[PDB]
Design a protein around this ligand. Structure first.
Ligand SMILES: O=C[C@H](O)[C@@H](O)[C@H](O[C@@H]1O[C@H](CO)[C@@H](O)[C@H](O)[C@H]1O)[C@H](O)CO
Ligand SMILES: [Cl-]
Length: 407
């Protein structure tokens, strides 16, 4: 009773995805973004494709570059990907890693000088995620050891052992900050789903290479936090911001976060080997997936951005929700066997190919308006790396590979 797309469609999609990753995404990053003046990678590329070697450089972006090239190398073996990953790692370790207090600085000047020394848990997570993947790809012990130390700092300095979860920002010396906002866009609240999602993601990847008992407990406690506090069963959306006791302090809905958490939650529970908890996760995850399917999609299959605090639907197509839906809908299909999820995956991909992709300038447009008009946003900046789209492509290729083997 398996309803599965025929081999031709499965393979056709997988080839376009592979082509997109290697010939557009990873090609753009390998050639436009390496910086030969300060080493490492540029912190910004404007809409016209101009790299900015003197732009300030965020840890998150640089961790994302590291993760993506490391992941691509592990799965595809292209020596250039290791080389690019190595370039990212060296700069990262030299300049972003705080050798005195531990963890990674928020932002450095292009030459490497600390510019914003705060220790944000979101950035610490991406560091762990990236270092753990580099370790997976190469077996480097320093990367793993650095990954472990950052974990230790988060638990030591940020863990709320009364209420679950984490204080999200500290100063350089690991003293809690009042303002935990990632940006001006975020609510001034003590807890955010966004930051806790990436702790989970980081910890799940670290657990792959360091299956330590206490990490397992921390990982499971985050999954449990998501099921009991962040995921809303009545709506099928993640609540975005909370106080310290996880009381909702927000009503906005973010479709891209929903669909990302949908597959991440499952990956995390399966990394953990937690069979007793898996049914509840699969249920929350399929719900997240359906809710996005029902409420977050334009008629062309692409995802809207969010519903704001006042209820306003932002219809802009940002690059990363499309990427995350690609994986989230393929995952929902693998989990439930319902082919409507496959069709949704195909719809979003066609949108990516037809609208999101910047064919002229390479890579993907950050934002596309509801009328199909691309905004003249930066191609690369603090918040736009190769991770969402690079990962989405790697995941889809591997997931399609498994489906193909149903024959
Ligand atoms: O997985 C989801 C991500 O964490 C998103 O939150 C990221 O989006 C960026 O979020 C920040 C903080 O809210 C915004 O200031 C920024 O404009 C968004 O692009 C996603 O990784 C994209 O960077
Ligand atoms: Cl990214």
């Amino acid at each position: 009773t398996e309803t599965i797309p025929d081999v031709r469609r499965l393979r056709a999609l997988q080839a376009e995805v592979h082509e997109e990753l290697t010939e557009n995404i990873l090609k753009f990053w390998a050639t436009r973004t390496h910086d030969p003046v300060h080493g490492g990678f540029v912190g910004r590329v404007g809409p016209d494709g101009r790299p900015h070697p003197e732009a300030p450089r965020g840890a998150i972006l640089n961790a994302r570059i590291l993760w993506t090239f490391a992941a691509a190398y592990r799965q595809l073996g292209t020596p250039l990907y290791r080389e690019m990953a190595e370039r990212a790692y060296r700069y990262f370790v030299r300049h972003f890693v705080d050798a005195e207090h531990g963890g990674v600085y928020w932002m450095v000047a292009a030459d490497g000088r600390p510019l914003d020394t705060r220790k944000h848990v979101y950035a610490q997570s991406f560091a762990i995620y990236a270092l753990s993947e580099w370790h997976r790809a190469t077996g480097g012990e320093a990367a793993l050891a650095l990954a472990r130390s950052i974990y230790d700092l988060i638990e030591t300095h940020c863990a709320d052992r009364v209420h679950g979860g984490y204080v999200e920002a500290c100063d350089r010396a690991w003293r809690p900050l009042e303002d935990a906002r990632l940006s001006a866009k975020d609510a001034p609240e003590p807890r955010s789903m966004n930051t806790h999602l990436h702790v989970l993601e980081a910890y799940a990847n670290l657990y792959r290479v360091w299956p330590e008992t206490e990490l397992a407990a921390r990982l499971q406690a985050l999954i449990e936090l998501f099921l009991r506090a962040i995921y809303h069963p009545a709506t099928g959306h993640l609540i975005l911001f909370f106080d310290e006791r996880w009381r909702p302090r927000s009503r906005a809905v973010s479709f891209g976060h929903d669909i990302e958490a949908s597959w991440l939650l499952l990956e995390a529970v399966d990394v953990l080997g937690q069979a007793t908890l898996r049914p509840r996760v699969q249920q929350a995850s399929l719900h997240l997936a359906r809710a996005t399917l029902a409420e977050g999609r334009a008629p062309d299959g692409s995802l809207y951005y969010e519903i704001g605090e006042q209820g306003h639907l932002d219809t802009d197509r940002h690059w990363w929700p499309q990427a995350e839906a690609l994986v989230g809908f393929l995952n929902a299909y693998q989990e439930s066997g319902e082919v409507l999820f496959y069709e949704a995956a195909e719809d979003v991909w066609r949108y990516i190919r037809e609208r999101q992709r910047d064919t002229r300038g390479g890579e993907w447009f950050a934002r596309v308006r509801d009328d199909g008009a691309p905004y003249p946003d930066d191609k690369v900046d603090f918040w736009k790396g190769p991770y969402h789209n690079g990962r989405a492509c790697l995941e889809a290729i591997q997931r399609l590979r498994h489906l193909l083997e149903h024959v």
